[model samples]
Target chain A: SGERKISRIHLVSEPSITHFLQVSWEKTLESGFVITLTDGHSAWTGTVSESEISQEADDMAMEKGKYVGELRKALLSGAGPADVYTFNFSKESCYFFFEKNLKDVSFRLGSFNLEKVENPAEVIRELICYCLDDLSQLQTEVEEAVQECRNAEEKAKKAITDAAMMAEELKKEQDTSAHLERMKKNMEQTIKDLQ
Target chain B: SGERKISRIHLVSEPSITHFLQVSWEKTLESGFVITLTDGHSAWTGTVSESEISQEADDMAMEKGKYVGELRKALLSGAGPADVYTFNFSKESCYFFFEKNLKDVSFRLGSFNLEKVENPAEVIRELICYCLDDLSQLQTEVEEAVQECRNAEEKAKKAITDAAMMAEELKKEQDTSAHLERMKKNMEQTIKDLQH
Candidate 1:
């Protein structure tokens, strides 16, 4: 009843291969939260009391079931959502995504796409640069749509086309946009200040 | 214990107003399934064998609780999934996005954004056009990425560049990219074939 696997996700090198980068979650205790990444069957678990950093990336492995006070303290502090929400975490550089949503109709489980990246800063760095290029490209598309959207105050435009609407959008985009933009901006700022 | 709200979403015309376009669901019986869209104060419910078309769009109303046998037959002939799956449906034209996943681990409840469009086809049309522009732009970014990603055959690239990689990415992109492409392609085909 109370004990249940709330959500999970699976990624692999080969679909036919049983081996996967699997991360699953269960409820954390009064003292906690739980995140377990079973990559290639190596289970790296994290709890609020003691969180450890592990690298199975060597031969492919688990998170040392040890604790890091900083990670533990972070999870212990709480002010969560009531209706629907998402909790995105970057623990010792491994990113985590968790959410529960009950919107208009369909039911979705998002935790599945959450991945644990090992060698971050620059490895993930180029990926972000690639993403930035995509972001720049898409913004052009949006401006174009908004352009077509503006012709004679199309019905959709009359409803939108202002900074106010951006707020309306901010909520939806809040889910992902600003975070990525912030990441890119922060990276650029870091680089700019460097050179 | 098994009884649960698998998921839900809330949208409003006014922030302070309790009035909203709320939709929800529950598991189906060996004999059926359930989908309910509550627009404003009106509740429009649908089930297999009794799936229906409602117009709360008319001063706000209900699905008129009735049997829609064709809907029943369609759902009854189910060939569902074992692993991760998304059942994107446009029952009588109201689109739906439902999925259960066990991927690298960020769970998403897609239903929250899943809305029952009242005057769709066109309403949704503009949205997709907007999405299309975004798509074309992003593809360019991705290609540019492959270009930069190609330099030194970057470790990410030693992974290599080939149509095979597209297949690798196609799985991820398969989730949404292709569907939207198909939708846009289908729409363009429809419009191009149209004299009206």
Candidate 2:
């Protein structure tokens, strides 16, 4: 019999803009299971029985991998609300409860042939790093967009000034022409009388 | 008898853009006259017999005073057709013909009175300066207007840019919110399954 192992981690946090969690594993698993709760009420539960990685697990893995940095920073900075996380496997799961203080960050592990393939602390740290990275990138993008706007404003100002100058030049030329016409007519009349 | 001296000056130059002339005098006269010819044929002639300046001359004088600087520049710049200017007074009138070359800027003096009240050269020089000043002011005004337009364009561009950036920020924020919602939903589902 080929040996297979499954693991999961769940995090629950008080509502906050900065609150985030990420979970990742070494390799794709054949099947996975998940269960979540919020405020003492069952929020979601699902089981996948497939020889290949399940779509839900795949998506979660991708997200966890992507935002590990952001999640780590939120956790380490203790900027988020009090929350809970539970990581589960076929026979093992880890639960993490996070509060305002770093000292209050705590976890519980469920045992079912619990072979420590990876340290829970390391896993959490990686997840946070990924999450933080994504968040930081987004912030950078926003800043760049703002800068572009400033540059565009400057360019627009210059163009408007140029257009105004051209318009004024045109007006002056027209006025000059009109004045010249009047002067010519007056001179013409005087010359006609003299002749 | 009060001493009243009337004088006139005329200029002729090469053909150019349609131009105008204006004259003003101190006192209203009983009669005023003008004559113009191109190449030899009389182009225009008019005589006025009134105690005041003719309506046409009055209007021309007003316009000339307003834009004299512009008129002077056009005349001195020689961007005009061959033309003649004749200033007439009771006893003296001067004729000026302008051509392309400085040497061609010539004139003739008609002497009917021996009295010398105003020097013809001084009169021509003063008239040119006055016309030039008026034209210069108008030109400056036009230049200022152009500058204003430029300033407005710049302001518009800045405003537009500001608006675009704000829109972009809004878009980014919305995206961020959507992502957050997705994450929240996923977490909610995980919690429900664990409970079941």
Candidate 3:
């Protein structure tokens, strides 16, 4: 059983110019949701049908993104530019630091930042509330455009019926006109003989 | 059982202009046909759905237009201005003599014609064949007009699909643009501190 109650989710990028990963669960097959990323000029959709129902923690410089129970971790173990991105579900926030490929000669330190955000869930709800209000309005105009097209269709049908009836009446009368004229002349000649 | 085979019947008037009664039997319910009368400028239709199955001959002044068995006789029997009309089916022809009410003093006789025609069925078939050819062409054009309307309906559907796809792609990217700019700025500042 599927239901529609546009429960949109928004994940805001802290310290970024309002960038986010917005999620829409409108027509998802089941518990899956669509993740939408917008780069201002363009947008993309990635439908996540299932989440990896498993995870682990690491004590290493580079590791892959994984879920340790409720906490998610992304570890890029010295792969090209080293990065470790994670979301601590226990804290309801995230910890992500990446090597910007900016390396010192010793490679001990490169450009990176420790991040912070307020209310992970609320921040998501905040932007989503803002966009959903306008999203429904986007839907309203399309519905009206569809109505106008059918308006022409019905009006045209009215005139089409009238035209058909007129032709049916016309063909039947042409023969009448021809017959009556002949009778009128016959009467005219017969009267001449009587007078 | 109704069949479509244009079997038209025509009754041409003698000594008069080429005028007559035309009958069509395309969609009659049973043993009836439509009688079309034309007076050059306009026309009328009288669908004869049922013919009086029985009749008899009469001898009178004003008699009604009636069927006398197979011979079909009509007497006006002195009615309105007084007139009579009839058709002889056995002869496959008709005889109609009307008293133009032009009675002298004794009202004996007025103005009327006692005359004829040729193959009634053949004359009907002649004009029907002529009109049917043009009638079919009239039906053909209407069919073409209907097809053009649907052509536009389908083309519009193609563009409708394209526009929806474009909108789906847009909302997803606004967040990406905002996130990438923030990360770019962070890298720039971090590099400055290292240089210091």
Candidate 4:
């Protein structure tokens, strides 16, 4: 069984960059997800698998001017499951907060530049929303890749069969050409003998 | 059977770019290899599978400025299989010549600008060498990914087992706590009765 493990997740924004976010998932004995995000300043990585969660925001503190924001916790409660939220201060003073619930969830917040987005809770919501959007896009791309792979395999099979048939037909033509050439030479010899 | 069909191949040169080349191979049934080379100006694709060989060079003539080269055939006679080669006139006037033999091959060609690489045959050889190198790297990465997948699977299994054990232990602790709470309440009631 051929299965795809790596997926290219494109973030939804003004400019779409391929492979901006990469999500790799393995669904065999146990299921898990690895999400990687990057901007101009730093690389953010988050992984959820085997009932564990881990995250790393590289160089977020070092580049203080570029990313001037703080992380805050927000508790989300309603009906299904309680979600814990945290903000990831990213590019252009933007905060991308990620919310972790029992199951996958999606949300959206108003868009604003670095200076305008001050509320930590809103920042966390937007961050989680970006992640969920990325995850959704990753799943779609994986499905498309799987489909493309299957189609390519089928085409390759057909090409093999067609090539085999052509090879046989070409062989026949080659044999016929050789026979005609031999007959022409024999006729020329007979005429020479008659002369 | 978890097998990765294709991975985006990146070329090794000045100003490294991703998705410069895409290599896709299927090992099941009749094995085959499909290599696609693209550099915005043109796209050259080649495939060899079973008894068939096919190639297509998109906009090869129109993008003459970007890709200034041609393809030539050079026979290398030996007791081995035939090698396939082509010139991919791409960015910075680089050539991607793929030499198709029974096994993998590696080589390095002298670097030159687009105008300098005039010989199509030499250019093709260089292009193939680049492709082969990228393919070699791709194979190594795939092996590494497979090993990582295996390790992750093992870790997941252990995590599941550990989680189950923890759940059982937590239930026993809860039961003991409840029993202790009831005994404490009964002692308080007995003391109140003695006071009355």
Q: After superposition, how far is residue B166 of candidate 3 from its true place, in Å?
A: 2.1
**Which has the better lDDT: candidate 3, or candidate 4?**
4
TM-score of chain B of each: 0.22, 0.40, 0.34, 0.36
Q: Can you write out model 4's per-residue Cα lDDT over B1-196, one digit (the tens) per residue?
A: 3122222233445234323333445653124445544332234555545332211223333332222122112111111234433222455444444333334764321111223223322222233333334444554555555555455555545555555555555555555555554554665565556556
Each model's chain A TM-score: 0.24, 0.37, 0.32, 0.38
Root-mean-square deviation (CA) per prediction: 31.1, 44.7, 43.0, 33.7
Q: Candidate 3 at A20: error in angstroms?
A: 78
Off by over 4 Å in 3: A1-195, B1-115, B175-196
Ranked by DockQ from best down, the candidates are 1, 2, 4, 3
- Model 3, B1-196: lDDT tens digits are 3322221112223223222334445543234444433322223334444342111113333332332211211121123334333221211322222222233422212111222332332332233333434334444444444455555455555445544454444434444444544554654465555556
The TM-scores, one per candidate, come to 0.16, 0.25, 0.22, 0.23
Cα lDDT listed for each candidate: 0.34, 0.35, 0.34, 0.37
lDDT of 2 by residue, B81-127 (tens): 54443333321232323222344463322112223223332232233
Q: Model 1 residue A79 lDDT?
A: 19
What DockQ values do the models have? 0.02, 0.02, 0.00, 0.01
Clashes of each: 34, 108, 39, 13
What is the lDDT for B35 in model 2?
25
